[PDB]
């Protein structure tokens, strides 16, 4: 099954119903994907999920409380990580690669810290380490974005100011139209508030683990100017991690991999299959 | 023909005999490669030249005075660029991609400035823009390397200090053994002195053109700690260029692409064929 056709599946775990999809053929080391702020199953780019599922099983899921997943979204990354782990382990998956975008990129760092032996390789897109000052103003970034209707809100959050970047943003919106049937619910107000809290506190709280201690192979992707996360913080990830490859994409922003999805797939497929 | 079997060819141009090799099948947009400090035809990594010549014609050459090319190597990048252009145009090649490593990475920047319409895409490995302070001390870096016999000199210049990096350096030395037959001459003392002068002055002289004016697609590759060029100067290239992709490779140095040749080929092949 591809992105458009994979059915939404459900699994009950410790009193929570998790909604998920499995793309591609089943494989021994699946890639588990962790979504951005407010995103649901339908915010994944089909070019990326189709492209990466050619070579491995790919799992996309709604964490607790998000979209068609039941329950209450917790207010912190550590709890989101524990919740994700209960889900993944309920599926019987013991060893896997991870791809985290934005908030999801915080979760994969924390997961690698607490459960190193369950993760093989890590992809971080559009994120930052714990403690970064830029996230102290995340609520004000969202207050600015709140004023915008959907297309402008999407371009504001994810794209650069140029016609070149914005047109690739309109292309991404169209790709998100491709799922016609059995679509996810929107995130929910409760989930959005919990995530806003969690993202802000990832920046405000003193780091709780050393980035240098994550020994896994990592592939870090970012655009030239991610306003939310600060592009330089991806260079910081690369400096502090012992085995990270960095890719920076031109004239791009927080939604770098939406801007250049085929470049991302090409790079990521090599990383997972061969690095 | 592959790296090991391609014959050394010669072409007489304006009183100079240029030595070169052509790998792969002839193609409409060849990739012209520009070598590092003291390097000859035999310093190219066969994994890289074989890998990239699967999908395009690849030309490696000795610039004026270097190795089996005749004449006097000039003392500056601008002249090396003019010389390269007389060579490339003598072959009948009017439009081409370029790959420049180290000194060669300075030449491809200058070439894109003076002859933009002859270049399609640009790859820069292990280099820096004009004017960078780190190159003011290039002569002292070479004075330190001068004290070392061949294996240690090679690891000092090209690799990081770890066993992981140094072992990939020993692997590179073995790959450079693969060419058994019809090998190039060494650079020559005159060529080495001219290049040392040229590299130092690329840093000492005020910039003569704006990096921002190079509009071509560029792919910039560097390791985590290039002592010669400063890794941050590759981030500077990425910031200043309008259409550059950056890749930084972990626990690596000035010889980044020797450390991870298959990663480099994978990334570069996509860039040339698809970006
Ligand atoms: Cl986000
Ligand atoms: Cl709950
Ligand atoms: Cl573990
Ligand atoms: Cl910070
Ligand atoms: Cl720690
Ligand atoms: Cl793309
Ligand atoms: Cl060099
Ligand atoms: Cl001459
Ligand atoms: Cl021109
Ligand atoms: Cl400088
Ligand atoms: Cl200029
Ligand atoms: Cl490699």
Set out the domains of chain A in order of their start, with CATH numbers: 1-275 (3.40.50.1820)
Maximum alpha-carbon separation in chain B: 48
Residues A32-50: b if buried by 16+ CB within 10 A, e if exposed? bbbbbbbbbbbbbbbbbbb
Pairing of strands B244-249, A244-249: antiparallel
Phi, psi dihedral angles at B207 (to 5 degrees) = -55, 145
Helix (H) or strand (E) holding A8: none
B34 vs A13: CA distance, rounded Å = 59
Determine the distance in angstroms separating the CA of A253 from the nearest CA of chain B, rounded to an integer.
13
E strands within chain B? 9-13, 16-23, 31-34, 58-61, 96-101, 119-125, 218-223, 244-249
| Residues in contact with A111: Cβ distance below 8 Å, sequence separation at least 6, in sequence order | A81, A84, A85, A98, A118, A119
The whole-angstrom separation of Cα A272 and Cα A252 is 24
For tokens 């060819």, the residue is B9
How far apart are alpha carbons B176 and B42 in whole angstroms?
A: 7
B246 vs A239, A242, A248: nearest CB: A248
Q: Best mutation site among A266, A268, A272, A275 for testing chain B: the one with the most B CBs within 10 Å?
A: A266
> What span, in angstroms and rounded, lies between the C-alpha atoms of A250 and A168?
12
**Which of B238, B245, B247 comes nearest A245 by C-beta?**
B247
| A219 Cα–ligand 6 center, Å | 17
SS3 category, B13? strand
Taking Cα atoms as reference points, which of A267, A123, A248 lies closest to residue B234? A248
Chain-centre distance for alpha carbon A8: 19
> Distance between CA B142 and CA B126 in Å, rounded?
16
Task: Round to whole Å and give the CA distance between B163 and A88.
Answer: 36
Rounded CA-CA distance A65/A52 in Å is 26
Helix axes B138-145, B189-204, angle to 10 degrees: 140
**What whole-number distance in Å separates Cα of residue A163 and Cα of residue A183?**
30
Disruptive mutation site among B235, B245, B262, B272 for chain A (greatest number of A CBs within 10 Å):
B245
Contact B59, B50 (CB under 8 A): no
Structure tokens at B46: 């066969």
> Based on C-alpha coordinates, what's the Rg of chain B?
17
Resolution in A: 1.5
B268 Cα: distance to centroid of ligand 7 (angstroms): 20
What residues of chain B have any CB closer than 8 angstroms to a CB in chain A? 224, 235, 238-239, 241-251, 262-263, 266-267, 270, 274-275
> Inter-chain contact A270–B274, Cβ cutoff 8 Å?
no
């Amino acid at each position: 099954n591809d992105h458009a056709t994979a059915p939404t599946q459900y699994i009950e775990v410790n009193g929570t119903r998790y909604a998920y999809r499995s793309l591609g053929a089943p494989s021994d080391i699946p890639l588990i994907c962790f979504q951005h702020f407010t995103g649901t199953l339908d915010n994944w780019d089909p070019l990326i999920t189709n492209g990466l599922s050619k070579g491995r099983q790919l799992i996309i899921f709604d964490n607790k409380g998000v979209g068609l997943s039941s329950g209450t979204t917790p207010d912190n990354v550590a709890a989101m990580t524990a919740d994700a782990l209960e889900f993944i382990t309920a599926l019987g998956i013991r060893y896997f690669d991870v791809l985290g975008f934005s908030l999801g990129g915080f979760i994969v760092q924390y997961m690698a810290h607490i459960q190193p032996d369950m993760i093989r390789k890590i992809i971080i897109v559009g994120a930052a380490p714990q403690g970064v000052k830029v996230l102290h103003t995340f609520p004000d970034l969202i207050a600015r974005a709140m004023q915008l209707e959907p297309k402008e809100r999407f371009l504001f959050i994810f794209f650069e100011q140029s016609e070149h970047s914005r047109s690739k943003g309109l292309a991404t919106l169209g790709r998100l139209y491709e799922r016609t049937t059995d679509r996810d619910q929107d995130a929910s107000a409760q989930a959005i508030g919990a995530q806003l809290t969690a993202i802000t506190n990832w920046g405000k709280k003193t780091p709780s683990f050393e980035i240098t201690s994550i020994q896994h192979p990592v592939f870090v992707v970012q655009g030239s100017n991610d306003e939310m996360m600060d592009t330089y913080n991806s260079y910081e990830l690369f400096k502090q991690l012992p085995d990270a490859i960095l890719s920076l994409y031109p004239d791009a922003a927080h939604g770098s991999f939406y801007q250049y999805p085929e470049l991302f797939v090409s790079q990521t497929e090599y990383f997972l299959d061969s690095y």
